[model samples]
Target: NSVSVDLPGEMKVLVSKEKNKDGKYDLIATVDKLELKGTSDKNNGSGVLEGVKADKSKVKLTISDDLGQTTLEVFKEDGKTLVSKKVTSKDKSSTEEKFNEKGELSEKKITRADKSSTEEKFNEKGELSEKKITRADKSSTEEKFNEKGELSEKKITRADKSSTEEKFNEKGEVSEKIITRADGTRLEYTGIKSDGSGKAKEVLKGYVLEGTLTAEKTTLVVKEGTVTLSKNISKSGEVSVELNDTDSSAATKKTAAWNSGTSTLTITVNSKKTKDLVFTKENTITVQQYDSNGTKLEGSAVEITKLDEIKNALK
Candidate 1:
């Protein structure tokens, strides 16, 4: 059996009267307060309302136990139904909930130990409608739920102001995701070779560059019987090149330059969890023209055929 204490609380009602210099009429504000204090000797408490026959603001009911657990609340005009309540735990984590005038929970806020916080809002029927999580990294994720508390939309803004917005299907599955990077760089794979590198070199130096690129794979070879070749990757792998102008037997054997500028590679990963992927394949390697300042020439697209077709024979 749990023990009960008779520690009673007190109520204070304030009445104000001011002449207001007779501008129009004096103003009077009344506030009702109740305090339930708990000490080591009295582990629980209560408050009593002596008189309830006047117009007043919301009534405050404050309760604190010996363990530092506190429940502070306020009642509506009737001084019975709660309009707002805040409960703080011993560890200082707090949950503050606000109710509508009709006494339905409208919003709830939680504070964490790390100074992070979250807010969740509900509709009149008490179903979750929206939620927001604010983290220490200055990033916040806001999500909206359907009337049934199902999925709707989610938005995330990072500290750098970059953000991601997502759409959800009716079944609560993620339908689409759009990401904006801090650096303003967006990489989306349109198809196989849409974002492939701009430069191309032939195997006359005696090598085929397998899918050695962001575009996956591009075949390379001189038009003439050209340079020597060897060690073809059965499916997908590297193509080594060594050029010897004197060793080529083709009359029109031409040379291609190696070592184009540095290639910047970016990767996007899916959440399927990685498994061993044995590449058995290969985008036609395309050529791009850019000035020294790295500005892409708008009309600079030209397909490199020898490397483009080699991908077909890579089996």
Candidate 2:
């Protein structure tokens, strides 16, 4: 059975009843203009209504008795305006949104049951301008963006009195990051690059060391009190050295013969006398020398018994 009633302002209401298997009539009611529909049974009731306009926005609602819950949603026809939803339970949470005229999301906010929330804002150009997050524990994080929509900086503050900051380059790349701890010590790192060659100098308390690295070779120069020790290592595994002692007016040129089958090294020393020496891995040497008169210098051929004895004798 059904009944209809006509109202004055172009509105009408309808009521219907149907017999169930239990011989009970289920009641349904509906109305026009609002198009609201509702049904009621012995144990529960539910209702739905839609197409209601409120200041350029359409509203829709749904209610049910199964879980005793209600949901309401509001949105605009063009979809660029406000669209929001709120859900209620033992704990309540909600989300809201707004868009620009160009249909870009302009802002958004989400609030959780614990009252913690996150808010995001965007520029008219559809780029994220800023974001803030607040936690229930009193900790928060905030981020800022550049006009180009790049992440410019981020700051994080903790409840335990610790914080961090990160910075980015225009290309949206992390250029530098700094972390400060509760303690006072700190560490740092730097990035450096070169095109196949580089040079660096370090001065110590007793010596100055100059180092150079290249595609084909590496060199080190150590200048001590009156002695200059220069070393060179080539890509082909050859090692060369030049030691000059200004105090003794002595200079020694030593080179490891890489191409030599016997693993020999050559040392040429120029002092009051000149000596050309070939040393072998077996601790033997072949020595030859000449004086300023171009005559063969005598007593120059000497075999090393102990290395320290030879060094002490030479000193």
Candidate 3:
């Protein structure tokens, strides 16, 4: 007599017995074979159970296969708690996984042919808490996650000892980034926003641009040493330029305005005298070439010279 069980795409088991002299069937042998057919030449595998051993309360089997290999352990009778599992491929790549008591993934690791590796970890609550990766060039990157499973920080280090660090806000936005070079020069950027607005400041640099932007207008101030040059634009389309000098008496002001179809610019040359040079369409004034003593020169020689000066200035 014989009994058989079949499972498609997996394996099949056949049990047979022989009748002894006492006319009773005695256990003979059992065979389990891989029933899945080969779909392609490169993607084919076969497995079979060659022998089995049975005792009062324990059973063990020896398996042979053409595939690489697999080892699995089931710690609980219900097959719910998986203590460890590992799968290796024909290539140098493989995957290993471990689970907690509650059937949650505790750790996972993957390795590739180029010797690069990646590892991930989960917290007690089944949240991905950390991840790290190492490259073939010996450079690596590590990331940390918050309790809410959001990426909180990331750090990348290069083989040359230069590195980059990033910090994230509660909204999962990059709040700050710092880059250090091998030459000891560092560049930093802060106040980063997801909407594409941010600020950058570089140390050991001479000049800096500080500004404010709005839907209507923009204002910028350029600072070098103790001198500041400010340029401002209003919503009504007016531009103002101010030069803040170290000596208050030497300060200068310039402004521009556009109305209807005409434009005009005025410059305040001497603050003490409140003297201004106003430019317009239909206006003319006296042109007198002055001497060192504040005396006006005479003769057609002076007139011709002043006209040439005015022409050069206009150009």
Candidate 4:
């Protein structure tokens, strides 16, 4: 009913089994300072077995049948160590499971006679974090999950070297995806729409009258001294813009100060004038001037997206 064996590292393994009053069998197995004990309905060993070593490492194994269902664990030694559970079935089939220090099934692998394999990784909370599969013909597919177990990315590769990949935000939203065929070209798709252009180059009436013109339809007095910047909305949702005339002291003058010559008319627009526009990035605004009758005049533009360019455009 008992046996003891000696290991190479002076480790001793003692194992024994006995019948319990409940008609089930009991087992006691110990290695060095760790012991594992379980009970079985018919002596093959079923139930929970656990042990702890002197170095703070531990072992926990749960068995449904001596050869049916089994899970094993060892923790605190190496967090990345995933010990595999082995099980045998019919038709050259087998299943393996692994666990991390958190006692979660950290990885799993299944193999069959078809020469194909599938594996998956799970996080500490038992969430499936990633999955991978290889087909009989060597094609493969991979999937990744976010913290909430949402599918964040997936890729499928065909035997013909074609592939498809999709990317989703952590919020389970779409943004970037791509597809390719063995001989066909690769195609990409994006659900992208914000502003027309973050940085743009344009050549319109070079001079932006600072609150100058009144609405023709409104028929407000269309006079000269009233020449000032009037905020107007274009069909394309032009957020607000301003023209900075300069002064002798190098200050920005928004009024019609005829003192400072037409040195430079600094143009500026606020960030996110509309819901569809954003000035969040560096901007390079290039421009050219034109006269009354389509004559290209001496006009220039300043790159003003942020504060740095604002001063540079003045004077």
Candidate 5:
């Protein structure tokens, strides 16, 4: 028996069964070829099913490239191509199979006779999980898997010049698109959940810090040189503060320098304090000039001024 299968631009012939003198089907043969003129070889002659010749058959073939030509006989083992001689070439011309440690088929690398290569991966059940092709300057694509081994996503990038990422659901359907720019920035989903009522909940903003300072014991020391009091402040943006030296019979006014970002506050005392030292919670200061015995003078006074630049080297 014989059967013919017509393919695009080519034909395949199969000797489904054969007979000898006993007239019983005992052998099989199959041939495939492209449509061409005056070519009778098994590879060139539209001969898909030539008559079987016992245990051995002579198959004529022609191998040609753009720059050269040759011919050879090809053998098969379990539907795979085998070569008799070892030839080295930059271009591959065969289909390769990848097997796992347990000898199970994990992937297949197919290189067509036209010099094109395709890589494919399969699941344990022999279902295709990925397919990628490299042609010209493009083609690095990958398929993603879900926890249960289902294909959930596919990414395709063409030579870094152009690329696209697509995410899919378990049903093998695209659920999101990530458009990447040539400069490497990308547009992606924000991953926000929308409220059913279409109104977003309000979020709170400002917070306050409040603390109290109590003085139980009081001691005063006065030196001849200028006395400096520095307070380190840590904050962002502009910060407002108030100061009052209420209950100290030493200084009248004070001077201070305040900075926000690097967090530093410097103060200098030069005037005399009256009775109660009160520092109102504002950006102000009190200064007091005192004698060596820590006694505030009634008329002797000095002015406290802010510094033009407070160098951070004081750290």
Candidate 6:
């Protein structure tokens, strides 16, 4: 509730303006003249306004009993009102009453396309109350309050589905969240215990060397009374050699130097027999050669073997 006192100039009469048929003041401008008067016990007036222009700028103002000052601001351009706001000195509160392009009162802008609208409500302390979201599909979510206006619970739901409920502990930590899907699958994650490591063992498998031969030739030989393999019987075979106890009877004291073409492989076998030697597995004393195109010449493997034997015979 408020009141206005008008005075045109220094030591002039104060005229009370009347409201027109449209219920608005009949004046040229909201404020056109002003004068000041000393305060008195009977009349506590400090400043005053008068005339048609001053009456148009007149605002409904209130002075608090504590501060003794209040104001309402009206913005105008070319004698047209744009916006009006009220300011109170008591609690420093302000209210903006918006207007549209047509000069009609409108609610503060509070909408977005395809999303929910957040409506704000202020508490006695001027803090925002629990917000409410109105979904585009006309669904609503309401956050409940406690006796102190603190948010206690928030309820959310879709049109065709049951609501998912969450519970927060006293420390504001989410204790539980239970979501049930449309397919009847329930997913729930809880913070109960913190384990540093997972429980599992890792096993590694040994790598094996395997191959398939496109071509091979093999032969066998008999020497003395024992059957010794004088020739390779398989194009490719899995053979590995390990140095075990030596056979003194099969020991050959002679060292042999052998060469296939210019490439040489030297060996001091225990005997003239190839089986008498114990060497690293891949150390093949004899090796076949092929053309750059990978085509094996018919008897290349046998030729390499024969060459090594001849070099041994010379030694």
Report the number of the highest-lDDT candidate: 2
Which residue ranges in model 4 land beyond 4 Å of their true spot? Answer: 1-82, 170-173, 180-315
Candidate 3 residue-wise lDDT, 13-116, digit = tens:
34334444655432222323212111111212223222212321112221225444433233344434565555555455767788787778899988787769
Q: How far is candidate 4 from the true structure (C-alpha RMSD, Å)?
A: 17.5
- What is the TM-score (0 to 1) of candidate 6? 0.21
RMSD of each: 16.9, 21.8, 19.9, 17.5, 22.2, 29.6
**TM-score, per-candidate, Cα-based:** 0.41, 0.33, 0.36, 0.35, 0.30, 0.21
Clashing pairs in 2: none
Model 1, range 106-189, lDDT digits (tens) per residue?
Answer: 999998866689999998788889999999788999999887777688989899877777767665655554555565432121
Give the per-residue lDDT digits (tens) of candidate 2, residues 202-249: 222233345666666667665555545555656674546555556644
Q: Residue 172 CA error for candidate 6 (Å)?
A: 2.5
Q: In model 5, which regions exceed 4 Å deviation?
A: 1-91, 112-116, 145-150, 170-173, 190-315
Clashing pairs in 6: 29-53, 29-56, 29-57, 30-56, 30-57, 31-54, 32-54, 251-270, 252-270
Show the colliding residue pairs in model 3. none
Per-residue lDDT of 159-196 in model 6, one digit per residue for the tens? 54545545555655445544443333333323412231
Find the 10 residues in a row with the least total lDDT in model 6: 200-209
Task: Report clashes for each candidate as comma-separated counts.
Answer: 5, 0, 0, 7, 35, 9
- Model 5: which ten-residue window has the lowest total lDDT? 196-205
In TM-score terms, candidate 5 sits at 0.30
**Against the correct fold, how does model 4 do in TM-score?**
0.35
Residue 72, candidate 1: C-alpha displacement in angstroms: 2.5
lDDT of each: 0.46, 0.52, 0.49, 0.49, 0.38, 0.36
lDDT of 5 at 33: 32
Decoy 1 TM-score against native: 0.41
Residue-level error in angstroms, candidate 3, position 164 = 0.9
List where candidate 1 sits over 4 angstroms from the true fold. Answer: 1-56, 59-67, 171-178, 183-315
